[PDB]
């Protein structure tokens, strides 16, 4: 058996610690893999003896007595958002894989200007869309109580993006009752954030 946190959220530029506990017959080592969304996992670290293994911004700690390990990510970048897999070897050299920890990295926004905008109709589509953007990490946007209305936060930056890193959530639907005023209602929101009235 091997266990690690299912989900973890952290802001860009910060530090994070992913714990992994394992109970196996013998111990031939403990691996950490990084796996980006829709992509193949990549080797990160390998620990056998007790101690700390540091590579760049990443560090992997192991305790054989406690059966414990943590991956320590410092100075979080956007590209660090991924699933992080933990695995160890048995007495026999078989490899046991833990269901990873999905790390969600929120961008660091020093100049929050949260607002909800209405995008013009596409004319290639029958649905209308509302955009909520430029909100800080302390802002929470939830889903819609309406089954005919779709809202999507948690978008991931492209791995090469030099510019315009910003949080955004989208809402859309066919119904006529849909408006950009009520689209984001009941979202945890700071002062000064803009919604269109009519």
């Amino acid at each position: 058996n091997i266990d690690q946190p299912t989900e973890m959220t952290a802001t860009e530029g910060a530090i994070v610690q992913i714990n992994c506990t394992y109970q196996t017959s013998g111990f031939n080592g403990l691996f950490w893999y990084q796996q980006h969304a829709g992509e193949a996992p990549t080797f990160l670290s390998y620990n056998v003896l007790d101690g700390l293994e540091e590579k760049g911004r990443f560090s992997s700690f192991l305790s054989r007595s406690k059966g414990y390990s943590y991956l320590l990510l410092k100075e979080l970048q956007m590209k660090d958002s991924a699933s992080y897999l933990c695995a160890s070897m048995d007495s026999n050299y078989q490899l046991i894989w833990g269901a990873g920890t999905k790390l969600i990295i929120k961008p660091n926004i020093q100049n929050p200007d949260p607002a909800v905008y209405q995008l013009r109709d596409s004319k290639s589509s029958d649905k209308s869309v509302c955009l909520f953007t430029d909100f800080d990490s302390q802002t929470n946007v939830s889903q819609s109580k309406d089954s005919d209305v779709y809202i999507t936060d948690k978008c991931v930056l492209d791995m090469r993006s030099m510019d315009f890193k910003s949080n955004s959530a989208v809402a859309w639907s066919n119904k006529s009752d849909f408006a950009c005023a009520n689209a984001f209602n009941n979202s945890i929101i700071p002062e000064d954030t803009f919604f269109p009235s009519p």
Partner: peptide, 18 residues
């Protein structure tokens, strides 16, 4: 697939277009 042009309110306010 459908794309939606940026809001007029966004451009003047943030000088950006989504």
């Amino acid at each position: 697939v459908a794309v939606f042009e940026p809001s007029e309110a966004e451009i003047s306010h943030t000088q950006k277009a989504t």
